[PDB]
Design a protein around this nucleic acid. Structure first.
Length: 269
DNA sequence: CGTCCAGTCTAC
DNA sequence: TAGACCTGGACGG
């Protein structure tokens, strides 16, 4: 997913796992090329936070748990189909690539990273990807400064629709959000990035925060349906531009589809 | 059947 | 930059 989905998944893990105790090893599916998580505890709690298009899990063993184990942090990226689900241990979804198992007492559940297409990745260590900019949701002011301070970067030579996907400057912005953000201001997607950003040193950088914040405020699971069909309908109904009838579409330089109304902009193919 | 469509990562 | 990495749903013949 994108910022909203990573943020809501994070909120999901914290609520679902608040009163759960995990035990044992962390199991990876045999087909997954991500690394084995070397971690075992008779009794540990799981928590989460999001930053842009990444989510950090913390595995925190209870007082006196065995084996001797310090807390462990994993950072996840979701690629095109990543997701977290809490399921019954015997009813694992089809592409559950990493699993944390509840300990007795109560019914035996699995917290699962589910990723159909396996573009998602996880790293040992809890470090954010170096080079990703601050979170458009949780680090707005730092994110804003990081863009205005670096408009000289050749990243801003590109059309604004391409620039908005560069995770060094818009960590959390993906394909639906660039369409919804540029539609709110009727900025041609192939206006030059530097041209639209120089003019501001509710604007484009403010909406990079407020638009995805709207997806989060729906409750539900953004571009997702872990919360039901109702919350997915609510998301489709919030969209004004992305995939919507009557809207134009072009391929950017990297073959990604940009949705917009009216003027393509000067740098259009 | 078949084609086409839905965010990094890295080899040229 | 262009292709690689994947699975499944939508749609066409």
């Amino acid at each position: 997913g994108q910022g909203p989905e990573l943020h809501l998944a994070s909120q999901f893990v914290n609520e679902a796992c608040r009163a759960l105790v995990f035990g044992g090893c962390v199991e990876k599916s045999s087909v997954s090329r991500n690394p084995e998580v070397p971690f075992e505890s008779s009794a540990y709690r799981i928590s989460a936070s999001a930053r842009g298009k990444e989510l950090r899990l913390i595995l925190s063993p209870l007082p006196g748990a065995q084996p001797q184990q310090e807390p462990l942090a994993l950072v996840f990226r979701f690629g095109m189909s990543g997701s977290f689900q809490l399921v019954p241990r015997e009813e694992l979804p089809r592409h559950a690539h990493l699993r944390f198992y509840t300990a007795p007492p109560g019914p035996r559940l699995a917290l699962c990273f589910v990723d159909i297409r396996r573009f998602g990745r996880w790293d040992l260590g809890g470090k954010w990807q170096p080079g990703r900019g601050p979170c458009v949701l949780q680090e707005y002011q730092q994110f804003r400064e990081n863009v205005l301070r670096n408009l000289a970067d050749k990243a801003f030579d590109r059309p604004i629709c391409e620039a908005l996907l560069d995770q060094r400057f818009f960590n959390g912005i993906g394909n639906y959000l660039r369409a919804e953000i540029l539609y709110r201001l009727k900025i041609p997607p192939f206006e030059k990035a530097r041209s639209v950003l120089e003019a501001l040193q509710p604007d484009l950088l403010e909406l990079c925060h407020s638009v995805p914040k709207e997806v989060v405020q729906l409750g539900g699971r953004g571009y997702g349906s872990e919360s039901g069909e109702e919350d997915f309908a609510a998301f489709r109904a919030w969209l004004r531009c992305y995939g919507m009838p009557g809207m134009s579409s072009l391929q950017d330089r990297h073959g990604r589809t940009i949705w917009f109304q009216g003027d393509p902009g000067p740098l259009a193919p």
